Each structure stands twice: as C-alpha cells, then as structure tokens.
Amino acid sequence: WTATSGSCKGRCFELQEVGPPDCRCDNLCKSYSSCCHDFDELCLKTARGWECTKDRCGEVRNEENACHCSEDCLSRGDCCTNYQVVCKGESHWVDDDCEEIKVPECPAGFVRPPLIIFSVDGFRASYMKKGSKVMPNIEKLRSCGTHAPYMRPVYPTKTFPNLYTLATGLYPESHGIVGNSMYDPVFDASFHLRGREKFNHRWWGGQPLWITATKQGVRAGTFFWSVSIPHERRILTILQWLSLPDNERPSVYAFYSEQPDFSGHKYGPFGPEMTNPLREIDKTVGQLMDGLKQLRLHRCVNVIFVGDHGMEDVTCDRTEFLSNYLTNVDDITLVPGTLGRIRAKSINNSKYDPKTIIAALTCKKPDQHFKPYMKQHLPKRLHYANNRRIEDIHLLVDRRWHVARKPLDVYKKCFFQGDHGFDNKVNSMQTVFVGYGPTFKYRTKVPPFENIELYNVMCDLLGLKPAPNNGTHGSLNHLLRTNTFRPTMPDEVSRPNYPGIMYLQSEFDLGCTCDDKVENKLEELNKRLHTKGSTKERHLLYGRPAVLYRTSYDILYHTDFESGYSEIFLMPLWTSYTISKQAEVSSIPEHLTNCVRPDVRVSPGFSQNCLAYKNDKQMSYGFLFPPYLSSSPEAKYDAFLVTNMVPMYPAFKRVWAYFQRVLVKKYASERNGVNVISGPIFDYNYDGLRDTEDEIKQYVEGSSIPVPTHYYSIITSCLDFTQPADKCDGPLSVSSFILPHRPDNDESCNSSEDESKWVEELMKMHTARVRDIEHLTGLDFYRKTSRSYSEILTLKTYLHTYESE
Ligand SMILES: *[C@@H]1O[C@H](CO)[C@@H](O[C@@H]2O[C@H](CO)[C@@H](O[C@@H]3O[C@H](CO[C@H]4O[C@H](CO)[C@@H](O)[C@H](O[C@H]5O[C@H](CO)[C@@H](O)[C@H](O)[C@@H]5O[C@H]5O[C@H](CO)[C@@H](O)[C@H](O)[C@@H]5O)[C@@H]4O)[C@@H](O)[C@H](O[C@H]4O[C@H](CO)[C@@H](O)[C@H](O)[C@@H]4O[C@H]4O[C@H](CO)[C@@H](O)[C@H](O)[C@@H]4O)[C@@H]3O)[C@H](O)[C@H]2NC(C)=O)[C@H](O)[C@H]1NC(C)=O
Ligand SMILES: NS(=O)(=O)C1(F)CCN(C(=O)N2CC3=C(CN(C(=O)c4cc(OCC5CCOCC5)nc(C5CC5)c4)C3)C2)CC1
Ligand SMILES: [Ca+2]
Ligand SMILES: [Ca+2]
Ligand SMILES: [Cl-]
Ligand SMILES: [K+]
Ligand code: NA
Ligand SMILES: [Zn+2]
C-alpha cells in the first residue's frame, strides 16, 4: 500500500528513498508502482524535446520544458546538453582534439574526481572496431583514454549475474545471482526477470559498490533507472545531481543502457538494424560529455564505459530438445536456453536419479550441441558450483545453440536471432572496457582482463577500501595514472624441512620393487651435489612457491626436478622442472616399467606404498616429474622415487601420459623451453579453495593416501621467445590448466580414439589462471623474479583461452 496523495514538488529524483506508505519520487518509484500522483508532470517533463535551437537562446524560463536554454540555466544546473554549442558558440566535446589530463581540473569544493559508470547491455567487444564509423564519441573515449581490446564476462554470460559481478567483484556463486532465473531451496522461493521476488534483498549477496561507498562516507547517486525513464532524462538527472551543493552531491554515478542488447536479440549481433542503436548510444555519450563540458567537469570526472557481455547469432532451429534423449522428460524441471540446469520436478519422487539422466545425455548424437556435467566437474575456470541455487546437473551449450525441454516450449512461448549466456571464453560473449579521466592513463592499450577485477579499481578511483572479493587487487594498476594500490606478497606460513639421507632401504616395507641393483668417485660427488640442490637454479626459476597455510613439508632436490613433499598428504604439493628446446624424450625401459624406489630422505611412515595400489582395483598411479624427460639414464631412477608418485585412475593416465610424453616436448619446442610446475588439487566441497585433510572423501583403498580431485600444471616461458625459458631477461608468458581427475573419459566423446585426437582439446577446455591454482592449493607462485609485483599479479590472472582472433 502506497498513499500516493503526497507530492514530488521539489523532490524530483530524490537521493534517499522513503518508506511505505509515503509516496516516492526517486528513479525507481515507477518499477514499484509507488510514485506520487504528480511524478510524470513534475519529474518527467518532455516539452520541446532535448536540444536547444537558435530561437530558444536567451528565452524566458518556462518551467514546463524538459530542459532550458534560458540565461539562468547553467546556475540552475538544467540546460539542454547542447546549450553552449547552439547559444554560446562552443564546440561539441567530440570535435575537440584530445589533450592529456595530467591532473584533475575540478571546480572549487570538489573533494575527489567524481566517477561515472556508463554501462551498456549486450555490447559485444568487436563493436568497437566494426561500428567505429557510427560511434565518434565512444571512439574518442577509447582512443584518448585507457582501453582493453575486450573484457571477459563471468559465466553465465547473462545480464544480472554480470551486472552484479561488476558491482561486487564476486563470482556469481559467491554473490548469489547465478542466473537470470533461480530457485533457492532453503528459502523455498524463486527469482525471475519479470516480477517482485527479484526486489527482495536476500537474493543479493556480497557488498556492492554503492553500499561500500555509503558505509565509508562517499555519497552515491542511485544506480538503477526504471525502464520508461528515457535516456535523455537519465543524463540530465546525473548532470543536475552534479550541480548539487558539496555536502549533498554524490561522488559516484551510474547510467545503464538496455541497448544494444534489446535489438541484438531481435536482429542478431550484426543485423543491419544494429547500426541505429549504436548511433543512439553514441549520441547519449555525446550528451553526457557535452554536459560535463558545460559544467567544466570534462577534465575532472573519471568515466568508465563498460559492457555486461556480448551477443551471438542464435535462432529457434538451432535448439536441442531433451525430449530426443530422455524418456522421463516430465519428471524434470529445466532452466533452458544458452545454458541448462536440471533438477527433479518433485522432491517427493525417490525414483529420480541424476546418474541415469546424465548418462542418457552423454555423447548420444554425433553432432550433439550440448554437454552434460555434474556441476563439480565443470571447468574450474567457470567457478560455477558453490551455491545451493546452482543445480547439480548442468548443460554447457555450444555457441549458436539453445537447449529446451520439449518442442512445445519453443513454439508455445521464429522470434529471436541473438542470445548470450554461453561459456565466458567464447569470443562472441566478450565485452568492452574504456576508462577516461585524470586517474586513467592517456592513450594506453591494456591487455584483456576479467570483469571481476573492476570493483577493486572503482574502489581505488573513489578512495574506498574494497570489501573482500574475487579480484586480485593490484592486477589492474597498469590502467591507472595514480591511485594505485600497492600490494605486497603474502607471508609464507610454513617453512620447509631439507631432509638428508636418514633411512636405510631395509626399513621400508612398501611392497615396491625396482630393477635398480646396478652400481666411481667422479660421478659419486656429482649425484651428492644434485641431491643438495646444484641444478636447482635450472629447475626452479621463480623461487620456490610459498606455502600459505600451516603444514609439514620437505624440499627434495634431484638432477632434473625439485619438489615440495607433504608429509601430511604423502605426495608433492608441487613439482618444478625445466625442459629446454633441445631436450630429448626417451621411453621407460622395459626393466623399469613397474619400478618404484624408496626415498631414503623420507620416513616409511610419511611415504606411499605399492601394496595399496595393488589392492585398489580402481586406482593406479603416475609420476609428477615424467620419466620420459629424464636427462640421463642414471637420472631416470629419480623419477621412480615413491615421493614422485601420485594416485591416478587408468582413464586419467591416458590423459597424463600424453601430456607428459608428447605435449611438454611440443611446448618446449614452440616456446623455446618451458618451466613446468605440476601438482595435485583437492577440492571435494567444490568451493575453489584448498581442502583441509578432514574434507577428503576418497583415499586409495586401505591407506591414508588421499585421492586428488584435479591435477594442475603451470607452464612458463619467456614472452620474448628468442630467449630460452631458463635465461629470460624480461616479461614471462604462462599457460596453465586444472584437469579433472576422473575415472572415465565420458567428458571426451572421441576418447576411444588415439590421444592425439582428444587430449589436447580436453586440456584447452580446462585452461586456468595461475590464481585459480593458488586458491585451490594455498601456494603463492613467482615469488623471486626480476619483474614488478603488479606485473606478476597481471600474469597470475592471465587466462589462455584458445579462441582465434
Ligand atoms: C571469492 O571471494 C569471496 C569473498 O571473499 C570468498 O567467499 C568468502 O569465503 C569464505 C570461506 O568460504 C567465507 O567465510 C565463511 O563465512 C561464514 C560467515 O558468512 C556470513 O557473513 C559474511 C560477511 O558479512 C557474508 O558475506 C556471508 O554471505 C554468504 O551467505 C549468504 C547466504 O546466507 C549470501 O547472501 C551470500 O551470497 C554469501 O553466500 C556465499 O558464501 C557462502 C559461505 O559463507 C556459501 O555457502 C554460499 O554458497 C555462497 O557462495 C554470510 O552471511 C563463517 O561463518 C565461516 O566460518 C566457518 O568455517 C570456519 C573455518 O575457518 C570455522 O572456523 C568456523 O567454525 C565456521 O564453521 C561453522 O559453520 C560451518 C558451516 O555451517 C559448520 O559446519 C561448522 O561446524 C561451524 O558451525 C567462514 O568464515 C565468506 O563468507 C565468503 N564470502 C562470500 C561473500 O561469499 C570466496 O571464497 C572467493 N572465491 C574464490 C574461488 O576464491
Ligand atoms: N535479454 S537479456 O539481456 O537476457 C534480459 F532479459 C535481462 C533483463 N532485462 C531488463 O529489461 N532490465 C535489465 C536491467 C534493467 C535496468 N537495470 C539496471 O538498472 C541495473 C544496473 C546495474 O548496474 C550495476 C553497475 C555496477 C557497477 O558497474 C556497472 C554496472 N545493476 C543492476 C542490478 C545488478 C544489480 C541493474 C538492469 C532492465 C531485459 C534483457
Ligand atoms: Ca545484459
Ligand atoms: Ca575446497
Ligand atoms: Cl539463466
Ligand atoms: K590398482
Ligand atoms: Na568417452
Ligand atoms: Zn540479453
């Protein structure tokens, strides 16, 4: 109930929202049907349009007009945005040459440069180039300011998840807005685009920028605009708020455009009908910039132009129907479209089995345009699992397709030619970023980055301390002229032990054997030196990783590799080795096929054993440093140490063996050497964070050997590939992955073929940031380089995506 008989006289677009049953006059009142009777008349004036003409110049202030061309308008803060151009001979902001903004040039009483965030729905990255002829204002921002060639959204590449990620710095799993449609079983409530449940605060986790600002005494313009408030009126309201007195005037502002998303759904991303909406967005940008120029704020304000996601070509005929796979299609609820989420239609059905649903959707058709996953098997880079609102069964839908339950859902609801929501690595889903202003750099291109990073920068731009988030603070310091945040490396928590030879062979009863009983003072001092770390500068190029939690571990040196060996998990946390361009692949000799050797530096009680592998019929084992890459026949014995062994399902050893025997050498040839750090990951509760021992759900049978959920590798080399990896003077180049440790290869539909046809493609799917691996292992990499820490942070957030240009 709203007593709508109050008035908006003097309160038009008021900043503090008032409580029912008092009537509202803020930019959201329309959307709650709560505006006062006179809101349209007083607050949404339209008379005479939005531009001065010559004949309006000097006019008598007529308060009915949408904007004013009268003499008092500048001092009232309510001129049309083109007033000075038409009536005072000034030029449009876009026609002025760009001039570096070295310091904020602000009017007296401005405490900090204001921030204006101009967000554009569905603005695909390639629009910057392909639409450049029709967006002169946007192109000036882009070329004069700081820009990325594109910005990576979060998954799913839907609107609300990405707008709220931009607001919070959080993955959707952590902020709670996991799609445009949702069911929360604890609430027993649903969230939709249409309707009222989406306004309830309990959906929205974390701390968005407007609340961060408020709590720390920075005033925020209300970020959200009701759909019917036209764009021109949104701009004028921002400009009016910027004329408020110092103690009332906000420091941060937001404008949101429904375009070009709205048209892109109807016409596809490059439909001829798309030229106009791009023109209109640019015209709005021009109005804002002309308006800031009138207020002498155009070399004072920082302006961000940012998109939520891109747009892809998608039509109704590219729909896969679950009715062509499942017989039981009535006992499921599907959240449909560019992603799929499945749950039971009824929680009273004890006959519902996710296992059989998944199998019925797995590699059933040769061209199948979706792939089912249990949510915990999704590529860890998506960070799309740790929320009760995300259903256990997920479908990753191929770009250009939809998934639906039954054909009747498509025709009883072709309309659309564009959509989005796909895997956030897909080129068509990439979006834009431009930063223009005194605090951003001048004419600078930066590398692509993820939108999770921007909350920290927006906090930096306003002098705010960010709430805890998924950004890596410092990783975008290179966008900014000043206001940089100076991070420091986290402190190592556990220091390693450096064990020498402490145990005799006969003290071990591991059930292992090796054909190694084969025996010289020249090469005896030499192996001694290798076991004390003589080659360590070769194999450990960036310092040892730091262990950021409390644990017990040992550094083990070898001729060809170095490891940090966990006495708690009975395996390495990490294994580091360097493979030069020249290095040779050999095979495992026949006599050493089943060889596993006790490590005389590590007690029997902190060692794995071969008997457990024999008795475990499901579980086999592999090595972290590959025997294939040993530098000499004698060095190869080191690779068979029980301390280099890790548990591996036979299905996964196919993947791993191919990576180690073929791919590492190929990368070394292509990149002119590589340094590899490999190791295990344990994430049984799928939270993206290192498990403690008491979270492990699976051990090798009859033992305390925990089973990893994943294996990682980080593969580093010189960015200037004319320098070899082990003597690189400048910036580095990295690619990494987090491979799921699975007992079958059901994920890979071509897995009955030779590994050359499917393994590398699996690895590409599970590409990862070093930072993802840091969270999952509690390690901190690249501790000792010649590079600045900010550049390292940027490197640690890099994702190798394997898309073309
Ligand atoms: C991305 O960045 C984010 C933000 O930094 C990272 O997420 C943080 O990670 C922390 C570790 O998981 C986590 O810390 C825990 O928080 C508990 C208190 O949390 C409440 O308060 C905060 C602060 O205001 C608030 O933000 C939280 O909001 C969550 O929950 C509501 C829904 O109720 C949502 O609105 C919101 O979206 C958010 O949901 C998300 O997080 C929760 C977990 O909090 C998930 O379950 C959801 O799926 C969703 O993703 C909360 O309101 C605190 O109680 C925890 O302490 C327990 O564990 C410690 C271990 O040290 C132990 O010492 C304690 O005893 C305690 O255990 C007790 O509870 C157990 C569980 O019931 C029980 O089994 C025990 O026996 C004990 O009784 C802990 O400190 C922090 O909350 C989140 N923050 C956010 C915003 O999500 C995230 O990790 C990053 N991602 C990556 C990959 O790096
Ligand atoms: N077809 S589709 O794209 O699948 C579609 F169906 C999706 C729905 N839809 C709409 O019709 N809506 C959607 C929106 C409006 C007006 N809105 C805002 O006003 C707004 C804006 C903002 O900005 C947050 C800023 C944080 C700092 O960084 C910049 C972004 N946040 C938010 C919320 C996160 C807090 C909202 C969203 C109409 C039609 C299109
Ligand atoms: Ca959107
Ligand atoms: Ca975990
Ligand atoms: Cl969705
Ligand atoms: K076995
Ligand atoms: Na298969
Ligand atoms: Zn859309």
Q: Briefly, what is this?
A:
This protein is α+β, with helices and mostly antiparallel strands. It has a domain at 505-797: Extracellular Endonuclease, subunit A (Extracellular Endonuclease, Chain A).
Structure description:
The structure is a monomer. Helix content is 22%, strand content 16%. It is α+β, with helices and mostly antiparallel strands. It has a domain at 505-797: Extracellular Endonuclease, Chain A (3-Layer(aba) Sandwich), CATH 3.40.570.10. The strands form 8 sheets. Strands 1, 2, 5, 6, 15, 16 and 17 form a 7-stranded mixed beta sheet that branches. Strands 19-20-21-24-25-26-27 form a 7-stranded antiparallel beta sheet. The chain has a 4-stranded antiparallel beta sheet with strand order 9-10-12-11, with no helix packed on it. β19 and β20 form a beta hairpin. The chain binds a molecule of 8 linked components (NAG-NAG-BMA-MAN-MAN-MAN-MAN-MAN), the ligand NS(=O)(=O)C1(F)CCN(C(=O)N2CC3=C(CN(C(=O)c4cc(OCC5CCOCC5)nc(C5CC5)c4)C3)C2)CC1, calcium ion (2 copies), chloride ion (CL), potassium ion, sodium ion and 1 more. Chloride ion binds at residues 156, 158, 179-181, 335. The PDB classes it as hydrolase.
